Amino acid sequence: AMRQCAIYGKGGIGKSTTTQNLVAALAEMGKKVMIVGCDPKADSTRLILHSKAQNTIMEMAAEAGTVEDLELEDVLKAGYGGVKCVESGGPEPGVGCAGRGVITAINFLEEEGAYEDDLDFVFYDVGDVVCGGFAMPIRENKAQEIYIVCSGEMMAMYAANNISKGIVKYANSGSVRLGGLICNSRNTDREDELIIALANKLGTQMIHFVPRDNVVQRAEIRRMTVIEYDPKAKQADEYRALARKVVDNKLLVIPNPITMDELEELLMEFG
Numbered sequence: 246a247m248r249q250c251a252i253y254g255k256g257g258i259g260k261s262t263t264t265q266n267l268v269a270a271l272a273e274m275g276k277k278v279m280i281v282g283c284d285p286k287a288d289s290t291r292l293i294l295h296s297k298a299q300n301t302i303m304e305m306a307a308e309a310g311t312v313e314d315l316e317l318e319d320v321l322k323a324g325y326g327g328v329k330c331v332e333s334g335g336p337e338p339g340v341g342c343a344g345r346g347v348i349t350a351i352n353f354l355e356e357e358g359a360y361e362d363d364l365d366f367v368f369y370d371v372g373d374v375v376c377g378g379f380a381m382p383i384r385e386n387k388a389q390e391i392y393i394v395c396s397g398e399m400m401a402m403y404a405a406n407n408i409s410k411g412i413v414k415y416a417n418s419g420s421v422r423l424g425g426l427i428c429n430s431r432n433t434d435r436e437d438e439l440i441i442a443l444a445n446k447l448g449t450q451m452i453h454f455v456p457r458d459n460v461v462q463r464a465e466i467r468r469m470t471v472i473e474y475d476p477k478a479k480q481a482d483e484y485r486a487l488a489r490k491v492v493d494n495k496l497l498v499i500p501n502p503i504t505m506d507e508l509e510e511l512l513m514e515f516g
């Protein structure tokens with residue numbers, strides 16, 4: 246049955262490249278997936294759809310000026326490995342905040358019957374907060390699992406710890422949990438020991454260390470994932486091991502965050 250996962254983490258650390266490459270690896274082995282992009286600039290489905298950008302629900306509900314008058318085939322397009330793609334977007338030419346844009350997007354999907362019988366995973370590519378609008382990708386009938394993409398810097402780790410605070414302070418005792426820390430590389434073999442040390446302190450795991458490799462940039466100027474553009478690359482096998490690890494994961498925790506006194510100690514021990 247449908248496991249609903251959501252990717253959180255800091256700005257610019259690699260959530261949409263890790264999400265799309267993980268999903269491509271999942272589709273390659275047989276899993277049936279839907280990516281729902283929860284970012285104002287539609288860029289969560291480009292490497293799967295080979296699109297310039299996908300046409301958002303919030304640019305087909307203000308364009309068509311609807312209330313309840315829009316079709317699912319106009320926002321759910323299939324791409325590589327048969328992955329289904331939805332793009333929420335913001336009121337990006339309009340006015341306001343995103344957040345709520347995700348709410349009037351997975352409610353649309355629910356109403357239009359997008360969550361079908363043979364779907365294995367639904368990945369939401371959200372942002373930096375498990376609060377309100379951006380947390381209804383985590384509500385009662387929604388995502389059970391959260392994976393935080395982070396790295397060796399102070400601000401990526403601080404973001405992981407604060408997202409983790411938002412997960413313990415998820416509304417009422419339903420069941421939104423932390424599945425692990427995906428470390429997206431930036432240094433060498435001391436950075437992985439830093440993320441493992443934070444993870445053990447939060448009560449999770451570093452479910453995979455993703456290397457920094459230029460094939461990623463080569464694949465995406467060509468609008469693809471590394472699994473599609475270059476299946477035999479060592480990096481492709483990195484997202485397939487992350488994909489295997491997420492598929493077998495049974496360590497959904499209710500995290501135990503550290504104080505800023507403690508994160509500074511960990512960071513001081515390293516850089």
Ligand SMILES: Nc1ncnc2c1ncn2[C@@H]1O[C@H](COP(=O)(O)OP(=O)(O)OP(=O)(O)O)[C@@H](O)[C@H]1O
Pocket residue numbers: 254255256257258259260261262263284429430455456457458459461462465
């Ligand atoms: N493993 C990697 N190897 C090489 N480059 C990478 C890797 N992971 C991410 N990148 C690159 O670093 C950048 C970060 O990726 P991306 O923009 O998808 O992160 P993001 O957190 O989703 O961004 P945002 O905060 O805007 O939502 C991109 O330019 C991407 O190509």
Ligand SMILES: [Mg+2]
Pocket residue numbers: 260261262284288
């Ligand atoms: Mg992104």
